[PDB]
């Protein structure tokens with residue numbers, strides 16, 4: 649809500665990372681490696697120790713095809729809510 653709104657501002661940071669690693673703006677286009685790259689950016693950005701990387705061995709098409717419910721089961725507690733907010737914004741906007 650207030651925390652989600654505030655932390656949404658740092659998501660802009662990933663745009664610099666996308667240009668850096670040649671990650672397309674639209675997640676539908678992402679390779680299994682570019683999905684991993686997004687999760688590694690977040691692991692560093694938000695200091696994580698367990699993004700379930702083995703659970704995200706998928707293309708950007710599969711990632712886009714998971715809904716909020718499946719995404720949150722797979723992703724770690726509270727962190728999943730942060731990642732979902734970023735993912736859904738990227739799908740909606742680019």
Ligand SMILES: [Ca+2]
Nearest residue numbers: 739740741742
């Ligand atoms: Ca789109």
